[PDB]
Amino acid sequence: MITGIARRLVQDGAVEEAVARSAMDQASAAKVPLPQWFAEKKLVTASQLAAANAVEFGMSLLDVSAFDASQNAVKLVSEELLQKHQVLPLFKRGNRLFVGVSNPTQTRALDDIKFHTNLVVEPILVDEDQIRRTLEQWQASNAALGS
Amino acid sequence: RQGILSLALKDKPALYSAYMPFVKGGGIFVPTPKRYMLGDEVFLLLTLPDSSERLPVAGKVIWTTPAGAQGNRAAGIGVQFPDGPEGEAVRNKIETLLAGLTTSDKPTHTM
């Protein structure tokens, strides 16, 4: 029976019932979390998977195309970490750094940033497409400042 | 209220928690248990602390936090102010009221 984000993707109309079952059974056989499997296999669009992830995982979701690039916090995360992981550092508030992730089940990436920054790291969902494009966009805007 | 949200902000702390300074054009967080999708067009009636005027904001959803979210984070939607004189006016009043408070360390409804 169809549970988790697989069920939510059905209720959202993003995927067929039998495809959701087959994905779910496959992920279970691989011992891989459902959102990771769905992203890897591209069963639905990134924004659809982000939408189902947000409601089922209880997480906030940001359209970063409306974020003011000039307020990004990319420079708090080293170039190495930004290629090791596929995350989009967003914005700092006090001892908190909000980090865009597209997989609700990142741990290494958030913990690495936690150790590198000595900040408290809060994940915010951002769909996988936007993280790819926007990180590059924001690196270009940061570079225009110099260095 | 058939697709018309409303938000009344009675003091400066309420406005601080609601305001979204990193949104292009400005944005405002509106508590609601209804699930919205990023990109949805919404109409908001926004009351600010300085007066009883209800400000019409025809904006786009750029942020969602779901019902039963992980922590003490309120369910609702972040609404981008539209391009145009009506939107910039709203942003301008807000940024005056919160002067020196936006780079505060105090947590908001969003970030």
Coordinates of C-alpha atoms in Angstrom, one line a residue:
Chain A
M1 CA 0.0 0.0 0.0
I2 CA 1.3 3.5 -0.9
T3 CA 2.6 5.6 2.0
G4 CA 5.0 8.5 2.6
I5 CA 5.9 10.9 -0.2
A6 CA 4.8 8.2 -2.7
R7 CA 1.2 8.6 -1.5
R8 CA 1.5 12.4 -1.5
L9 CA 2.8 12.4 -5.1
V10 CA -0.2 10.4 -6.1
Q11 CA -2.6 12.7 -4.3
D12 CA -0.8 15.7 -6.0
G13 CA -1.3 14.0 -9.4
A14 CA 2.4 14.0 -10.1
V15 CA 2.8 10.2 -10.6
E16 CA 0.6 7.2 -11.4
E17 CA -0.3 4.7 -8.7
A18 CA 1.6 1.7 -10.2
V19 CA 4.7 3.8 -10.8
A20 CA 4.6 4.9 -7.2
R21 CA 4.3 1.3 -6.0
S22 CA 7.2 0.2 -8.2
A23 CA 9.4 3.1 -7.1
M24 CA 8.5 2.4 -3.5
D25 CA 9.3 -1.3 -3.7
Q26 CA 12.5 -0.6 -5.5
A27 CA 13.7 2.0 -3.0
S28 CA 12.9 -0.5 -0.2
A29 CA 14.9 -3.2 -1.9
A30 CA 17.8 -0.8 -2.4
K31 CA 17.5 0.3 1.3
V32 CA 17.4 3.9 0.0
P33 CA 15.1 6.7 1.3
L34 CA 12.1 7.4 -0.9
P35 CA 12.9 11.0 -1.7
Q36 CA 16.5 10.1 -2.7
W37 CA 15.3 7.3 -4.9
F38 CA 12.6 9.5 -6.5
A39 CA 15.1 12.3 -7.2
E40 CA 17.7 9.8 -8.5
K41 CA 15.2 8.3 -10.9
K42 CA 13.5 11.5 -11.8
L43 CA 10.0 10.1 -11.4
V44 CA 8.4 13.5 -11.0
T45 CA 9.7 17.0 -11.6
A46 CA 12.0 18.6 -9.0
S47 CA 9.3 21.1 -7.9
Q48 CA 6.7 18.4 -7.5
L49 CA 9.0 16.2 -5.4
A50 CA 9.9 19.4 -3.4
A51 CA 6.2 20.1 -2.8
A52 CA 5.4 16.5 -1.6
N53 CA 8.6 16.5 0.5
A54 CA 7.7 19.7 2.3
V55 CA 4.2 18.6 3.5
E56 CA 5.2 15.0 4.3
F57 CA 8.5 15.9 6.1
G58 CA 7.1 18.9 7.9
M59 CA 9.6 21.3 6.3
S60 CA 9.6 24.8 5.0
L61 CA 10.0 25.3 1.2
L62 CA 11.5 28.4 -0.5
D63 CA 11.3 29.6 -4.1
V64 CA 14.9 30.9 -4.3
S65 CA 14.3 32.6 -7.6
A66 CA 12.6 35.3 -5.4
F67 CA 15.5 35.5 -2.9
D68 CA 17.7 38.7 -3.1
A69 CA 21.0 37.2 -4.3
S70 CA 22.8 40.2 -2.7
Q71 CA 21.8 38.8 0.7
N72 CA 23.1 35.2 0.2
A73 CA 25.3 33.5 2.7
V74 CA 27.3 31.3 0.2
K75 CA 30.6 32.7 1.5
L76 CA 30.2 31.0 4.9
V77 CA 30.6 27.6 3.2
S78 CA 34.0 26.6 1.7
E79 CA 34.3 26.0 -2.1
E80 CA 35.2 22.4 -1.2
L81 CA 32.0 21.8 0.7
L82 CA 29.9 23.4 -2.0
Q83 CA 31.3 20.8 -4.5
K84 CA 31.1 17.9 -2.1
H85 CA 27.5 18.5 -1.5
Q86 CA 24.6 19.8 -3.5
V87 CA 23.3 22.4 -1.1
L88 CA 22.6 26.2 -1.4
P89 CA 23.6 28.2 1.7
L90 CA 20.9 30.8 2.0
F91 CA 20.9 33.3 4.8
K92 CA 22.2 33.9 8.3
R93 CA 20.2 35.0 11.4
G94 CA 22.3 35.2 14.5
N95 CA 24.0 31.8 15.2
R96 CA 21.7 30.2 12.6
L97 CA 22.6 29.5 9.0
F98 CA 19.6 28.4 6.8
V99 CA 20.8 25.9 4.2
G100 CA 18.8 25.0 1.1
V101 CA 18.6 21.2 0.6
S102 CA 16.6 19.2 -1.9
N103 CA 16.8 15.8 -0.1
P104 CA 15.1 15.9 3.3
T105 CA 17.6 13.2 4.5
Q106 CA 20.9 15.1 4.1
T107 CA 23.0 14.6 7.2
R108 CA 26.6 14.6 6.1
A109 CA 26.2 17.9 4.3
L110 CA 24.5 19.7 7.2
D111 CA 26.9 18.3 9.8
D112 CA 29.9 19.2 7.6
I113 CA 28.6 22.8 7.4
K114 CA 27.9 22.7 11.1
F115 CA 31.5 21.9 11.9
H116 CA 33.0 24.3 9.3
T117 CA 30.9 27.3 10.4
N118 CA 30.4 26.6 14.1
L119 CA 26.8 27.8 13.5
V120 CA 23.5 26.1 14.0
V121 CA 22.4 24.9 10.6
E122 CA 18.7 24.8 9.7
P123 CA 17.6 23.0 6.5
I124 CA 15.0 24.6 4.2
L125 CA 13.7 22.7 1.2
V126 CA 14.7 24.1 -2.2
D127 CA 14.0 22.1 -5.2
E128 CA 16.9 20.2 -6.9
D129 CA 16.7 22.3 -10.1
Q130 CA 16.8 25.6 -8.3
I131 CA 19.8 24.6 -6.1
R132 CA 21.9 23.7 -9.1
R133 CA 21.1 26.9 -11.1
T134 CA 21.0 29.4 -8.2
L135 CA 24.2 28.4 -6.6
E136 CA 26.0 29.1 -9.9
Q137 CA 24.0 32.4 -10.3
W138 CA 25.0 33.4 -6.8
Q139 CA 28.6 32.5 -7.3
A140 CA 28.7 34.8 -10.3
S141 CA 27.1 37.6 -8.3
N142 CA 29.5 37.1 -5.5
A143 CA 32.5 37.1 -7.8
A144 CA 31.6 40.4 -9.3
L145 CA 32.4 41.9 -5.9
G146 CA 36.0 40.9 -6.5
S147 CA 38.7 38.5 -5.2
Chain B
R1 CA -12.9 35.2 2.5
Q2 CA -13.3 33.1 -0.7
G3 CA -9.6 33.0 -1.5
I4 CA -8.8 36.2 0.3
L5 CA -6.3 36.0 3.2
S6 CA -5.9 38.6 5.9
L7 CA -3.1 39.4 8.3
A8 CA -3.2 42.1 11.0
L9 CA 0.1 43.1 12.6
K10 CA -0.6 45.0 15.8
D11 CA 2.9 46.0 16.9
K12 CA 6.5 46.2 15.8
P13 CA 7.5 42.7 17.0
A14 CA 4.6 41.1 15.0
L15 CA 5.8 42.9 11.9
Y16 CA 9.4 41.9 12.5
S17 CA 8.5 38.2 12.7
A18 CA 6.3 38.5 9.6
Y19 CA 8.7 40.5 7.4
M20 CA 10.8 38.8 4.8
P21 CA 13.7 41.2 4.0
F22 CA 15.5 38.7 1.6
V23 CA 12.6 38.5 -0.8
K24 CA 13.1 40.6 -3.9
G25 CA 10.6 43.4 -3.7
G26 CA 9.9 42.5 -0.1
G27 CA 7.8 39.7 1.3
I28 CA 5.4 39.0 4.2
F29 CA 4.7 35.8 6.1
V30 CA 1.0 35.0 6.5
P31 CA 0.0 32.2 8.9
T32 CA -2.6 29.8 7.6
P33 CA -3.0 26.0 7.7
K34 CA -4.0 25.8 4.0
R35 CA -1.4 24.1 1.8
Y36 CA -0.3 26.4 -1.1
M37 CA 2.1 25.7 -3.9
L38 CA 5.1 27.9 -4.7
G39 CA 4.1 30.3 -7.5
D40 CA 0.4 30.5 -6.4
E41 CA -1.2 33.9 -6.8
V42 CA -2.8 35.1 -3.6
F43 CA -4.6 38.2 -2.4
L44 CA -3.8 39.5 1.0
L45 CA -5.4 42.2 3.1
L46 CA -2.4 43.5 5.3
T47 CA -2.9 45.7 8.3
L48 CA 0.2 47.3 9.7
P49 CA 0.9 48.5 13.2
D50 CA 0.8 52.2 12.4
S51 CA -2.9 52.5 11.4
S52 CA -6.2 50.7 10.7
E53 CA -5.9 50.8 7.0
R54 CA -6.1 47.4 5.3
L55 CA -3.5 47.2 2.5
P56 CA -4.3 45.1 -0.6
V57 CA -1.3 43.0 -1.7
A58 CA -1.7 40.9 -4.9
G59 CA 1.3 38.7 -4.4
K60 CA 3.0 35.4 -5.2
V61 CA 3.7 32.5 -2.8
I62 CA 7.4 32.1 -2.5
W63 CA 7.6 30.2 0.8
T64 CA 5.5 27.6 2.5
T65 CA 5.6 26.1 6.0
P66 CA 3.2 23.2 6.4
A67 CA 0.6 22.4 9.1
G68 CA 2.3 20.3 11.7
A69 CA 5.8 21.5 10.8
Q70 CA 8.8 20.2 12.6
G71 CA 9.3 22.7 15.4
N72 CA 7.7 25.9 16.8
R73 CA 7.4 27.2 13.2
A74 CA 4.1 28.6 12.2
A75 CA 2.2 27.1 9.2
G76 CA 1.6 29.6 6.4
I77 CA 2.9 31.2 3.3
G78 CA 5.4 33.8 2.4
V79 CA 4.0 36.3 0.0
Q80 CA 6.2 38.3 -2.4
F81 CA 5.2 41.9 -2.9
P82 CA 4.5 42.7 -6.6
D83 CA 6.6 44.9 -8.7
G84 CA 4.9 48.3 -8.7
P85 CA 4.2 51.4 -6.7
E86 CA 1.7 49.6 -4.5
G87 CA 4.3 47.0 -3.5
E88 CA 7.2 49.3 -2.9
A89 CA 5.0 51.5 -0.7
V90 CA 4.2 48.6 1.6
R91 CA 7.9 47.6 1.7
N92 CA 8.9 51.2 2.5
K93 CA 6.5 51.6 5.5
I94 CA 7.7 48.3 6.9
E95 CA 11.4 49.0 6.6
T96 CA 10.8 52.4 8.4
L97 CA 9.0 50.7 11.3
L98 CA 11.7 48.1 11.8
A99 CA 14.7 50.4 11.3
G100 CA 17.8 48.8 12.8
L101 CA 15.8 45.7 13.7
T102 CA 16.1 43.8 10.5
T103 CA 19.8 42.7 11.0
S104 CA 18.8 41.7 14.5
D105 CA 19.5 38.1 15.6
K106 CA 15.9 37.6 16.6
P107 CA 14.2 34.7 14.9
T108 CA 11.3 35.4 12.4
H109 CA 8.5 33.3 11.0
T110 CA 10.7 32.5 8.0
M111 CA 14.4 33.2 8.3

